[PDB]
C-alpha cells in the first residue's frame, strides 16, 4: 500500500498547503468526481532528511478513515472544482510490486509554498 504518486519534498521551513481548488495531482485515469484527497507528511530520520508529502485519494491510504476536512498533524486536504465528497475505493492505493508510482504533476499556475517545486 503506497501513494499512487511520487512525493513533494519540503525543502523549506513552510509546510505543504494549497489554495482551495488546487494541489491535486494530475491522473488521466481518474475522473472529475475523484479529484479530492489529502497529503501526508512522512519525515525520514543520525540526521533528519527533508519531509516528504505523499498524496492519497480521499477514503484511501493511512488516513482512509478521516473525512475530508478532519484536523490531524501532517494531514492537509486538497480538491479540484467538481470533486465529490465520497470515498475513492475504486482507485485505492498502489501495490509497489504490481505497479509503480506516477510522477506527481500539478497544473500550470498552481500556487506552491516556499521550498516546494514541481518539475
Amino acid at each position: 500500500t503506497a501513494s499512487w504518486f511520487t512525493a513533494l519534498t519540503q525543502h523549506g521551513k513552510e509546510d505543504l498547503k494549497f489554495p482551495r481548488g488546487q494541489g491535486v495531482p494530475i491522473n488521466t485515469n481518474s475522473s472529475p468526481d475523484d479529484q479530492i484527497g489529502y497529503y501526508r507528511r512522512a519525515t525520514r530520520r543520525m540526521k533528519d532528511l527533508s519531509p516528504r508529502w505523499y498524496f492519497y485519494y480521499l477514503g484511501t491510504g493511512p488516513e482512509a478513515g478521516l473525512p475530508y476536512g478532519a484536523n490531524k498533524d501532517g494531514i492537509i486536504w486538497v480538491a479540484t472544482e467538481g470533486a465529490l465528497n465520497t470515498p475513492k475505493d475504486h482507485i485505492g492505493t498502489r501495490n509497489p510490486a504490481n505497479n509503480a508510482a506516477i510522477v506527481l504533476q500539478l497544473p500550470q499556475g498552481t500556487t506552491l509554498p516556499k521550498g516546494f517545486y514541481a518539475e
Partner: nanobody
Amino acid sequence: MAEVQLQASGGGLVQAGDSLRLSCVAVSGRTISTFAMGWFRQAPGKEREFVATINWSGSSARYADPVEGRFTISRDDAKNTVYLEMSSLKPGDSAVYYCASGRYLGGITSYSQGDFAPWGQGTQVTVSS
C-alpha cells in the same frame, strides 16, 4: 453501501398554504463547507425530483419550476446544515425530502442527480387540501 452521513428532519403533516422548514445535517465528521448542496424529493409513486441547489458559497441558488418562488434554500457551514424553507405549500409538494452533497466549489449549472453524492435519509412532508 455506506452509513448515512446526511440526515433530514423537520417534516410533518401540514395544511395547504402553510409553511415548513427542513434541515439536513452532515454527521459523523462530514462537512458541507466549500461544497455545493442539493434538496431532492420523491412523491409517492414518483421519481426523484430536483428541488433546489445552492452553490458552495451561498451566493447563488436554483429552484425547480414548480417550487420556484415558494421555496428558499440556505446553508450554515458552521453547523453543517442545509435548509429548505417551504411556503404556500400545495398537496402536490407532498413527498419525501432529502439533501445531497454536491460538487466541490460548484453551483447552479450542476443540478443533475449525478452532480450529487452522497445522499441523505429523508423526512416525510404531507400537505392536505
